[PDB]
Every structure is written in structure tokens, then in C-alpha cells.
Design a binder for this molecule. Structure first.
Ligand SMILES: O=C(O)Cc1ccccc1Nc1c(Cl)cccc1Cl
Ligand SMILES: O=C(O)Cc1ccccc1Nc1c(Cl)cccc1Cl
Ligand SMILES: O=C(O)Cc1ccccc1Nc1c(Cl)cccc1Cl
Ligand SMILES: O=C(O)Cc1ccccc1Nc1c(Cl)cccc1Cl
Ligand SMILES: O=C(O)Cc1ccccc1Nc1c(Cl)cccc1Cl
Ligand SMILES: O=C(O)Cc1ccccc1Nc1c(Cl)cccc1Cl
Ligand code: NA
Ligand code: NA
Ligand code: NA
Ligand code: NA
Ligand code: NA
Length: 583
């Protein structure tokens, strides 16, 4: 029955608290530069209207689309044009174009103040008003991460409240809190980047691209499931993801809850690992299901060669329904190989497709396709060889030195990219060494390829907004499945014209001496990028000499009596020695 008030329905389904949270998240993601207490006022107006429609669904306006109602609140914001410029032009449109226009203005790098955890203040805020404290967390994250997957953010906010519940009772609040914040922050940044990649997949490559990624991932998690159980779940899951990517946050959350319930009702057909998820309350249940471990591969699965290489009829089977035959290939390959990266499984399925396209046209197709697994294996061997070599490099240098080796590599590949992005991306890539290299053998390929696909996606999302390198545009737009190898294959960009030495990056005031370590690292890594932008062909030894003099010089002026005097008067010596080392 379609005679439904949508707002009433979502309020009925989700409950007041989650409804309010999701509405607050929607406003914070679309209007990232509005204060908390202004969005709270809008949430409260829409909650009062929802409750009116719950009481009486025939009440005037209860029949508007939820998204239409929300858009209307946006366009009634007095400071819309003033703060968001021509985002206010979006107000002239009809749905769904109005919404697509709003989504166009979400800012991926709003460069908002860095949140410093002050444990004494936060514990006071928390004790003062817990709900406010909860909403302030949803607002601060959502406005920094405007594609953050909204129901997961509700889950993280409950865990964030739990952290303060335990830690505020301690004597040293700081010692309890800070390691937990740190843990949270890494999990929330990864989560943001994961959902950002799902949104950019849908938008730039079609919803079929995301479906293929999810078929591969779900078949590895739930290897006893039938192909059509996987395609049903992937279909519902992709609709949830797309709804969240399109800002339909109440519908995304409501659908997600229905999917969690479906998976728990069918847990016998899917995975034994689901049992611990399925008695949890709804947000925790869903989270637990998304993070579930790969079930054990069943015994007795026939070898892949039986259907895909050995069988006489591969071409006939393929030609009858090419898409279904390849989806089934992907599913069969993925359930069998939890130790492969999902992107490697997609690359395997693409190459299997190209082989059949080629072989099935020949006189004797079977002699040509019988050996396809030998043609495929280089797609497993190449990433395995890269992972071994990059994890060695990581163990040789440590995380910071590995970040610096990545700075050199990426600035050579993409020297037109702005310095702060080269630094951010190289720092994130270096942390993949920390996150993955010490893992069990069967987890290293999924771990490193997954993180690379998140971080290269972040580069692609930034570069889409201000494209400066043709080679980045090619790697970012050509094919999602080959994005990571496309970047690995970039060498020194030969079209790049060097800039003059940008000496501000090698000149400091005394306040450098008391920067926290992360910030000192960033100052040094920024200089390193700038070296390469001035001298793209500089040798690793030249770079090392320079950077060694650099740290020697900062060390010396930091230990001076008159620090600023040293930096200012001795500074040009560093700048001349740097130009000599590079000559
Ligand atoms: O209103 C309350 O009881 C707690 C409170 C205090 C300050 C600001 C907001 C809120 N609640 C609140 C929150 Cl935290 C999020 C969305 C909507 C509302 Cl009404
Ligand atoms: O730190 C970020 O950039 C976002 C983030 C994610 C998870 C947990 C905490 C934070 N930031 C954060 C901090 Cl560092 C302090 C107080 C309140 C918040 Cl939301
Ligand atoms: O760490 C940063 O500030 C860069 C950044 C911005 C937005 C979202 C994620 C990230 N970093 C990041 C990424 Cl892109 C992937 C996995 C894990 C992390 Cl911490
Ligand atoms: O068939 C595809 O294009 C990929 C795919 C993957 C998982 C689940 C379903 C599908 N196909 C599919 C699609 Cl793309 C749209 C609507 C319904 C279905 Cl069954
Ligand atoms: O980065 C590359 O080109 C090689 C490669 C391929 C697949 C997966 C990871 C990696 N490299 C990689 C690894 Cl294996 C660990 C930490 C950081 C990086 Cl950049
Ligand atoms: O290794 C050092 O002590 C010199 C130094 C200081 C700051 C930043 C980088 C470097 N060295 C460095 C360089 Cl210049 C390039 C690739 C890898 C490394 Cl570890
Ligand atoms: Na099946
Ligand atoms: Na729906
Ligand atoms: Na391929
Ligand atoms: Na390479
Ligand atoms: Na300077």
C-alpha cells in the first residue's frame, strides 16, 4: 500500500533517537559549515513534523517525499547563498535534480579545525549532557566526512559515548581516553574512505561496478551460500549503499535494518559466523554482520577447472548468458579463495572474460581455453611479488622511512599533484605497511589491496575536483578494477616541467622546534616533495644528503640560545648547500 506518509513510516521504523541522529547527519553532510545548534533546530522541526504525521498520516504535507521535505528545509536556510554560494542555485530545481545538485556541492576536504581531544573538557561536556555530546560527535564527523555511511556513524557514536562512560570515572581520564580516541579515529577514517569508494564507484562506474565488488566480497565471507543467495543479498546491500550515497539516509538505515534481519533469518544458509551478530540490538547487529570473518570454505567444492576450462561446452554456456556466466565465475572463484584480494578476483574475472571472447571465435576453442588458469595466474603472482617487496621495504625503513620512500615514488609519478595531497597520500600508504605487513599470509593480499583501493580512491576524489595530471586522470577514470596496477605502472612523469626551488619550504621560524612529532614529520615530508618538484631526476643519494643536512640544520637551530636568530641568519646556508647537493 502506497497511501503512506514516508516521514511517519521512517519515524515508526527507526525510533525517535535514530531518526534524529540520521536527520542530523543529513544536515551536517549537506551543510558542512553550519553550526551544530542551527542543525539541531532543523532536526527538531522535522522531528515535530514527523510526530504530527505519525499521529495523523492524512495531515497536510505528510505525503511529501522525505527527501523533498529535507530539501525544503535546506532551501529555507537564510545563510545558504552567503555560505555555500551557488549551491543555493540548486533550490531552482525539481527532484531528483535538486538533490543531485546538492550532492555535487558536498566538500571532500572542507579543511575544518583539527579536533584535539581535551579529556577534562570532554568529560565535563559528557557528564553535563550525554545526548548533546552524542549529537556533537555525529555533527563533527559527518561534516568532515560528508559521505560517511550514516547508520555506521550511529553505531560509532554509541561506542564513543561508551568510551566516555568508562573513562570519565577514571582518575587519569587522559590515559584511559586518548588511546581509545586514537583507535576510534583510525576505524572511522577507514570507514569513511570505504563508503567514499562505494559512492565514487556507483557515481563514476555504475551500480554494476559496486555489485561486482560486493559479489566477490560476499562470496568470500559466505562461501557456503548459493549464487542466488549472494546475488539477492548483494542487490539489497547495493540499494542500501546507493541510498546512503544519495543522501536518502532514513531509507538507507531502514533498508539496512531489513537486510540485517533477512541475513539473520537466513543465517543457516549463509554462515555459522553470523550467530554472534544476530542476537545483538540493530545497529550493533549490522555492524557485526559487516565485519564478520570469512566462513570456512566447505569441503568438496569441485575444482574450478571443471566448469570453466575442462568442460567441452564453456563457449556455448558462456554465449547463452555471458553476464550470468561471468557473475557465476566470479562467485565460484571468490568462495574458494579467501586469501585473494577482491580486486585480484575482479581482475581474474575480467581476464577470464577476455580469454573467452578471444578463444570462442577460433576454430578449436577448447584447446585455447583449456589452459586459461595458466594464463590467469600472473594476476595472482604480480601482487604477491609486490606485497613481498613493499613489506620488505617497510620492515627495512620503519613506517616513517617507508612514508618517505613513498613520497619519492609518488611525487615522481604525479609531480603536478599539490604538495599537501602528495604528503597525505604517501603518509596513508606508508601506514598500510603498519596495518598489513605483519598479518597472516592469507590476509596480506586482501589487506594491502583493500587499503590501497581506499587511499587511491581518496587521491582520485581529490584529483577529480582539481585535475592537474593526465596520468592520474587516466588511472582514476579508466577502470576501477585496474586502478591500483595502473598506479603501480606509472614511472617518472616525462611530460613534467620542473619549478624553481621553492625555498620557503626550507626556511623556518623558532616555533618549528616545539611542533608535535607528526607535524615535524609533515614539515620534512613537504620539503622532500618540493625537492623532487624542483629536481624530478635527483638521485636517492642527493635526496638523502639534502634531507640529512635539513634535519641537522633544524636540530642545530633548535638547540641554539637564540633559535629564531639562528634560523634567520644561518638559514641561507642550508638553502645554498641544498642547491649545491642537487647541482
Ligand atoms: O534536546 C536534548 O534533550 C539534548 C540536546 C541538547 C543540545 C542539542 C541537541 C540535543 N538533542 C538533539 C541531538 Cl543531540 C541531536 C538531534 C536532535 C536533538 Cl533534539
Ligand atoms: O578525529 C577525527 O578527525 C574524527 C574522529 C573520529 C573518531 C573519534 C574521534 C574523532 N574526532 C574527535 C576528537 Cl579527536 C575529539 C573529540 C571529538 C571527536 Cl569527533
Ligand atoms: O588520514 C587522513 O587525514 C586522510 C584521510 C582523509 C579522509 C578519509 C580517510 C583518510 N585516511 C585513510 C584512508 Cl584514505 C584510508 C584508510 C585509512 C585512512 Cl586513516
Ligand atoms: O547481473 C549483474 O549485472 C550483476 C549482479 C550482481 C549481483 C546481483 C545481481 C546482479 N545482477 C542484477 C542487476 Cl546488475 C540488477 C538487477 C538485478 C540483478 Cl540479479
Ligand atoms: O604500491 C604498489 O605499487 C605495490 C603494491 C601492490 C599491491 C598492494 C600493495 C602494494 N604496495 C604497498 C604494500 Cl604491499 C604495503 C604498504 C604500502 C604499499 Cl604502497
Ligand atoms: O633518512 C634520513 O635520515 C634522511 C631523511 C630525512 C627526512 C626525510 C627523508 C629522509 N631520507 C629519505 C629520503 Cl630523502 C628519500 C627516501 C627515503 C628516505 Cl628515509
Ligand atoms: Na549456486
Ligand atoms: Na527502499
Ligand atoms: Na584483468
Ligand atoms: Na612500478
Ligand atoms: Na618557511
Amino acid at each position: 500500500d502506497t497511501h503512506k506518509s514516508e516521514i511517519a513510516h521512517r519515524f515508526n521504523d527507526l525510533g525517535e533517537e535514530n531518526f534524529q541522529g540520521l536527520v542530523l547527519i543529513a544536515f551536517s553532510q549537506y551543510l558542512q559549515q553550519c553550526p551544530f545548534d542551527e542543525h539541531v533546530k532543523l532536526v527538531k522541526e522535522l522531528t515535530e513534523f514527523a510526530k504530527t504525521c505519525v499521529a495523523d498520516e492524512s495531515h497536510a504535507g505528510c505525503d511529501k517525499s522525505l527527501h523533498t521535505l529535507f530539501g525544503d528545509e535546506l532551501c529555507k536556510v537564510a545563510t545558504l547563498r552567503e555560505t555555500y554560494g551557488d549551491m543555493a542555485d540548486c533550490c531552482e530545481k525539481q527532484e531528483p535534480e535538486r538533490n543531485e545538485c546538492f550532492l555535487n556541492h558536498k566538500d571532500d576536504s572542507p579543511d575544518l579545525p583539527k579536533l584535539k581531544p581535551e579529556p577534562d573538557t570532554l568529560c565535563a561536556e559528557f557528564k553535563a549532557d550525554e545526548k548533546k555530546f552524542w549529537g556533537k560527535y555525529l555533527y563533527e564527523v559527518a561534516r568532515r566526512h560528508p559521505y560517511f555511511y550514516a547508520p555506521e556513524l550511529l553505531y560509532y557514536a554509541n561506542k564513543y559515548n561508551g568510551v566516555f562512560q568508562e573513562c570519565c570515572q577514571a582518575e587519569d581520564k587522559g590515559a584511559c581516553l586518548l588511546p581509545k580516541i586514537d583507535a576510534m579515529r583510525e576505524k572511522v577514517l577507514a570507514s569513511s574512505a570505504r563508503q567514499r569508494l562505494r559512492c565514487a564507484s556507483i557515481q563514476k562506474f555504475g551500480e554494476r561496478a559496486l555489485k561486482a565488488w560486493s559479489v566477490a566480497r560476499l562470496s568470500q565471507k559466505f562461501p557456503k551460500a548459493d549464487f542466488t543467495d549472494v546475488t539477492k543479498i548483494v542487490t539489497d546491500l547495493t540499494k542500501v549503499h546507493k541510498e546512503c550515497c544519495h543522501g536518502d539516509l532514513l531509507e538507507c538505515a531502514d533498508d539496512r535494518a531489513d537486510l540485517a534481519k533477512y541475513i539473520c533469518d537466513h543465517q543457516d544458509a549463509l554462515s555459522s559466523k553470523l550467530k554472534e551478530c544476530c542476537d545483538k540490538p540493530v545497529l550493533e547487529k549490522s555492524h557485526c554482520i559487516a565485519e564478520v570473518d570469512k566462513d570456512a570454505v566447505p569441503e568438496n567444492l569441485p575444482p574450478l577447472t571443471a566448469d570453466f576450462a575442462e568442460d567441452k561446452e564453456v563457449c556455448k554456456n558462456y554465449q547463452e548468458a555471458k553476464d550470468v556466466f561471468l557473475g557465476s565465475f566470479l562467485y565460484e572463484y571468490s568462495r574458494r579463495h579467501p586469501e585473494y584480494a577482491v580486486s585480484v578476483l575482479l581482475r581474474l574475472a575480467k581476464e577470464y572474460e577476455a580469454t573467452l571472447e578471444d578463444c570462442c571465435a577460433k576454430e578449436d576453442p577448447h584447446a585455447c581455453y583449456a589452459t586459461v588458469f595458466d594464463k590467469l595466474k600472473h594476476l595472482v603472482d604480480e601482487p604477491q611479488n609486490l606485497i613481498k617487496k613493499n613489506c620488505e621495504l617497510f620492515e627495512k625503513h620503519g613506517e616513517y622511512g617507508f612514508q618517505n620512500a613513498l613520497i619519492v615514488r609518488y611525487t615522481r609519478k604525479a609531480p603536478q599533484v599539490s604538495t599537501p595531497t602528495l604528503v597525505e597520500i604517501s603518509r596513508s600508504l606508508g601506514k598500510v605497511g603498519t596495518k598489513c605487513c605483519a598479518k597472516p599470509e592469507s590476509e596480506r593480499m586482501p589487506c594491502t589491496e583493500d587499503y590501497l583501493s581506499l587511499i587511491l580512491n581518496r587521491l582520485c576524489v581529490l584529483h577529480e575536483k582539481t585535475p592537474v595530471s593526465e596520468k592520474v586522470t587516466k588511472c582514476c577514470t579508466e577502470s576501477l578494477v585496474n586502478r591500483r596496477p595502473c598506479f603501480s605502472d606509472l614511472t617518472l612523469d616525462e611530460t613534467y616541467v620542473p619549478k624553481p626551488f621553492d625555498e620557503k619550504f626550507f626556511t623556518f621560524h623558532a616555533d618549528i622546534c616545539t611542533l608535535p612529532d607528526t607535524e615535524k614529520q609533515i614539515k620534512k615530508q613537504t620539503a622532500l616533495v618540493e625537492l623532487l618538484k624542483h629536481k624530478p631526476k635527483a638521485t636517492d643519494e642527493q635526496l638523502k644528503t639534502v634531507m640529512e643536512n635539513f634535519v641537522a640544520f633544524v636540530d642545530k637551530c633548535c638547540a641554539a640560545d637564540d633559535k629564531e636568530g639562528c634560523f634567520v641568519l644561518e638559514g641561507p646556508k642550508l638553502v645554498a648547500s641544498t642547491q649545491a647537493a642537487l647541482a
